[PDB]
Design a protein around this nucleic acid. Structure first.
Ligand SMILES: C[C@H]1COc2c(N3CCN(C)CC3)c(F)cc3c(=O)c(C(=O)O)cn1c23
Ligand SMILES: C[C@H]1COc2c(N3CCN(C)CC3)c(F)cc3c(=O)c(C(=O)O)cn1c23
Ligand SMILES: [Mg+2]
Ligand SMILES: [Mg+2]
Lengths: 194, 471, 485, 198
DNA sequence: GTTGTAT
DNA sequence: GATCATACAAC
DNA sequence: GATCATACAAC
DNA sequence: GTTGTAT
């Protein structure tokens, strides 16, 4: 456990210093942040709101990437570093949970956060530190989220595991890629409307 | 270059403009009504939820739905200004007795704001319903809204001493009001005690009402201030935190986080030793943990340097009879009691007039059902409903209404079991009209009905005392 | 740690999450419906406004109120997103035919943002009322709202081709639509034409529907793309600001702009010109003054002596947004799926949705007319046999027995019997029958007519055409955008 | 006649829908509250001699504000920047960009407050302007008003009714501000209680 | 600085 | 959505 | 209230 | 960069 008095504007940090039990919850907006922050067990569970839609790095200029304030917050939280400074052995959290809303928009933010993690935090995903919350989010009380998704004794997590990197690399490039035509085809192909 | 220009002295405009914003901010924004102890916003949110049908029994509605209405109808201001007020009426730390039941993020004790009106839905609180009881029985005066295309109440029935129970605050113009919360039960006790022995005194009133009872609990050191406060309407009191070093309860309007941040600052500036650690192990089911330091010395310093111990200055200012007045405990009780009497009477008169009206039309129907053969013969012979009414009135000596009531009679109500069904109702009304007539005639009953209907509230909504008074 | 943990494949979840958001946006946000040419939020605002009762006849209602019920009953998104979408369809420059009437600062062409909701009030536009006509006669299917405690319409009646007339745009996922506004009267003439002559060709149609008719006006350069868009749904068009050269009072040229292209901000172009004039990227400009008044556009670019206005003009047309291209991408939702439709296909779509709405109404009107006359037949018999009727009633203890007798004595249905039991004594006057008779007689005619319309498809189309001519006759404009080669 | 010609740097506030003319003897500067009204004014203002300068929120009370706070306020800053007059030891009334400063606040009580905060600023840090008879006050018959509505009623000099802010006794003026705006509350409390008809 | 209705 | 200044009284 | 970055396609 | 629905 920490001792405080030490020294992101947001990100409600926990009270322990054991990146083996501690957890970071990346929720979207301070609407879901308060609910999550007001019943998280501030001992091994910290929250960090991702304001707005995360930048799609699979189509962004590595200059605009190093510019985004949101991606700097998430990296600043983790404490891993970036690119040549990637130090998985220094991650402040052994569990990064993606707790986006249960709407489509949240589903979108899921893909963005995943592309960001897979591209510029692969070592994290390769080590299995990335999970995905499984809600049944601002329209939810404190005890409601705690007794449903945030409590370890209960709840249900989804460990992100990559199988065929090639397939993974291909997918992102297809969906989050620059080429649009390929993406459309995918829509036309794997999509049932009526 | 203007055509019709006029001259306006500076001092003249300044005095005019200022008074205009002063009065408006005082008697219509920042100061509560001594009666229902509400300020225009809260009163509009309540009457809003009411008309919207977000009653405690009905399901919740999205705040955007509520704010949208309260704004487009009564309160001509910003969503934030409203939704923000609505959010305080739903926080246990803010109101001693909440006036709203919302779902979703409605803020935290740590200063955390509420969520977006697109995520949170809410509805009246059960106890809040008492603020509106019999609102639709002419118990309150109504007025046109800013748009002049809607009507709103100047005050709510307030079947419980809201002002004293929940408190008031605060900042106006050239004056500010600060009233602390009290226990629902204790207050009611005071109300009754006054209705019993008007010759009561400050000391006596304090027998059933120790003092404030903040929704956070904590402790109030000293009692001398409470007295002078209840006697003059102005006074000061100290509020300390419940500790055992762990802190269990913080003072009124005090933030745990802020205290935490400030405690950290005092730790890194030769302002206190011992400070080994300062954590906040507060859960969703309770509240803040903090050698050779004695602690009692460092603990005594924290309360005298930080915010763990604060002073609450009584300044009971409300709006009585259109003017802001510094009222005392008695002045507030008498003011509430008088408002209560007006409502029971007003309501009683309302039922009275309805029953009597109902009986009048009931007497006719009977007369008609008795002579259905002639009544129908009269109608059948009648060419126009206008003539049909004149005849019935001339034959059976009936009034325009009674006659109209007869003409609007469904055939299915011309059966046998019907007559006796109207008689049974009619008979019951005479007893009602006769009972209500006695209540309006006997000031004693109205008073008793008040006492009774209060104890019913104290029995359904009263809490245990949270704030422990010390000396 | 946890207890019950599952394992998700990155590629697996990715494709799932994306496919969800992908379709979500396509069929439920970005692209509109080919029939009413509306998108969820626009349709929810219109219907919502209909329920709030803010019709052309009734007075305006605070904006916050409108968005308040629309967000609380239909559109499960941010307040801003609704109010924004509402304001837009109230701007003469954003909507070729506005669907909303506002009161107060609803923004300006110069990019000005409308005032806060706490200031502006709005209501339906007289024409928007056509988008809802017979909404309550079961001409449109409804469905549960997001909360499953409110019922909303999948599509609207739309008694005028709102897709072509007001256009669309447009950004979704994997796709994006772009349709230009047209002239009301013209669009209608096109719809009517395709109805009377199915063998019509794009050329034949373009004879009455020349092309785009944007709200601001301006000029179109090259019709080649216009025919390409109508025949394939994809095409390129060149748009140019209507201009004119004037001679200042001193005797030098003065370039005057009166009608910028569609979706072109005057001020944005004013700032663009200054950045180019102060950058030596364009010389010859004496000054750039905006003399636009609350009664017209006047953007003046005065040229210096010894300088060809024309030379500067073309330079502006080539460098500023004073001349731009319009990417015809006529993509709309049809049969649940997004499709790139031609002009004919979009018309055929409207005519059909038009036939359906009419029939349903006719049916709805019939079923009601008949249901009534049935009750009228009962009331008559009852008013003919009032004595015996009243006898049966009074001699009955329970209504169940009273009704049962009336039905059995006069051979009446449960509906008819109840009707007789609910008759007011006032209905038992002399003049009352002759009234109920007239009504009944009138119903037999209506039911006859309505029975015919549903028997003759020739009458349904004729009813449509006739009703279009009326919409046209009442809301049609004069063409604003001049097409030229 | 003399007028602007774009291309100019100006370096004026981001807001401020400055006019076209450059004659500080015809042009007008309208100090509106919020862009809700500013937008109505900005569009439909005869953009030739009428400039719109939106003031956001409640202007700082100079009577209770430290000079160090006055020099930090961007709201008052933009104003002095719009006039081009100067501050304190530089205030040149002979260098003002406008000879007509029209205060146009909302027709609500809150509007009457901003109106109060302004005049104190104009009388405490722009006295020369008021002593020159430039400060005027719109007399409407604002966010809930259309373009043609604003102009036809208060912005058009051919039908608008304006009022010239004139000062009688500077002694009585210094006192009224010291009471109504001064850090003193008791006096202000007594004033309200004495000159207020509920 | 902080409290709460306001621009 | 989050965040920015400010009036107004009173510790 | 005003503003701040972002997804998404096409140009 | 700009367009228009969304976070
Ligand atoms: C959902 C929130 C997300 O954050 C937003 C923005 N940011 C993204 C993150 N940046 C760090 C700071 C700025 C933004 F610039 C604009 C809006 C906005 O207009 C908006 C709305 O509902 O109308 C809602 N939101 C916005
Ligand atoms: C009326 C406007 C005036 O401007 C405002 C602020 N500013 C003052 C001027 N500053 C230069 C920039 C910040 C502010 F910080 C907050 C609010 C605010 O919360 C708010 C509301 O209706 O809830 C309304 N307004 C605010
Ligand atoms: Mg605010
Ligand atoms: Mg936005």
């Amino acid at each position: 456990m920490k001792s405080g008095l030490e020294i992101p504007g947001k990100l409600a940090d926990c009270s322990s210093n054991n990146p083996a039990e501690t957890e970071l919850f990346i929720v979207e907006g301070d609407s879901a942040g308060g609910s999550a922050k007001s019943g998280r067990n501030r001992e091994f569970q910290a929250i960090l709101p991702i304001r707005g839609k995360i930048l799609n790095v699979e189509k962004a200029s590595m200059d605009k990437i190093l510019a985004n304030e949101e991606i700097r917050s998430l990296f600043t939280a983790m404490g891993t570093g970036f690119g040549a400074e990637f130090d998985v052995s220094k991650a402040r959290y052994q569990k990064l949970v993606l707790m986006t809303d249960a709407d489509v928009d949240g589903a979108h933010i899921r893909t963005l956060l995943l592309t960001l993690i897979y591209r510029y935090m692969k070592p994290i995903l390769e080590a299995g530190y990335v999970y995905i919350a499984q809600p049944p989010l601002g329209e939810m009380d404190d005890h409601q989220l705690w007794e449903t998704t945030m409590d370890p004794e209960h709840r249900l997590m989804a460990r992100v595991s990559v199988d065929d990197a090639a397939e993974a690399d291909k997918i992102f490039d297809m969906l989050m890629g620059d080429r649009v035509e390929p993406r459309r085809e995918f829509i036309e192909e794997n999509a049932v409307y009526s | 270059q203007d055509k019709n220009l006029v001259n306006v002295n500076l001092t003249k405009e300044m005095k005019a403009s200022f008074i205009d914003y002063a009065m408006s901010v005082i008697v219509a924004r920042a100061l509560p009504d001594v009666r229902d102890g509400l300020k225009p916003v809260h009163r509009r949110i309540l009457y809003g939820m009411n008309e919207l049908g977000v009653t405690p029994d009905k399901p919740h509605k999205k705040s955007a739905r509520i704010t949208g209405d309260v704004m487009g109808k009564y309160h001509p201001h910003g969503d934030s200004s409203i939704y923000e007020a609505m959010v305080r009426m739903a926080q246990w730390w803010s109101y001693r007795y909440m006036l709203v039941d919302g779902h979703g993020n409605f803020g935290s004790m740590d200063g955390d704001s509420a969520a977006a009106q697109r995520y949170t839905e809410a509805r009246m609180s059960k106890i809040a319903l008492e603020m509106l009881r019999d609102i639709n029985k002419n118990t309150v005066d109504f007025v046109d809204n800013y748009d002049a295309n809607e009507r709103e109440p100047l005050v709510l029935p307030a079947r419980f001493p809201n002002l004293l129970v929940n408190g008031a605050t605060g900042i106006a113009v050239g004056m500010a009001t600060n009233i602390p919360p009290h226990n629902l039960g204790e207050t009611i006790d005071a109300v009754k005690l006054v209705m019993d022995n008007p010759e009561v005194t400050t000391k006596d009133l304090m027998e059933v009402l120790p003092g404030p009872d903040f929704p956070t609990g904590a402790l109030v050191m000293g009692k001398s201030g409470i007295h002078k406060a209840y006697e003059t309407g102005k006074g000061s009191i100290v509020l300390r935190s419940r500790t055992e070093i762990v802190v269990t309860e913080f003072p009124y309007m005090v933030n745990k986080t802020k205290v935490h941040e400030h405690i950290v600052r005092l730790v890194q500036e030769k302002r206190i030793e011992g400070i080994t650690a300062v954590r906040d192990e507060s859960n969703r089911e309770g509240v803040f943990v903090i050698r050779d330091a004695s602690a009692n010395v460092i603990l005594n310093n924290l309360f005298k340097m930080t915010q763990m111990q604060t002073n609450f200055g009584f300044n009971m200012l409300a709006i009585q009879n259109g003017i802001p007045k510094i009222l005392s405990l008695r002045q507030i009780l008498d003011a509430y009691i008088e408002h209560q009497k007006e409502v029971v009477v007003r309501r009683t008169r309302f039922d009275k007039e309805k029953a009597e009206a109902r009986a009048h039309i009931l007497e006719g129907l009977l007369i008609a059902l008795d002579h259905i053969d002639e009544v129908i013969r009269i109608i059948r012979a009648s060419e126009t409903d206008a003539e049909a009414q004149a005849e019935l009135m001339s034959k059976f000596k009936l009034s325009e209404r009674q006659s109209q009531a007869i003409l609007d009679m469904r055939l299915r109500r011309l059966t046998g079991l019907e007559r006796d069904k109207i008689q049974s109702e009619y008979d019951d009304l005479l007893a009602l009209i006769a009972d209500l007539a006695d209540i309006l005639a006997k000031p004693e009953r109205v008073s008793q009905i008040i006492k009774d209907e209060l104890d019913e509230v104290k029995r359904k909504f009263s809490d245990k005392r949270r704030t422990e008074l010390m000396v």
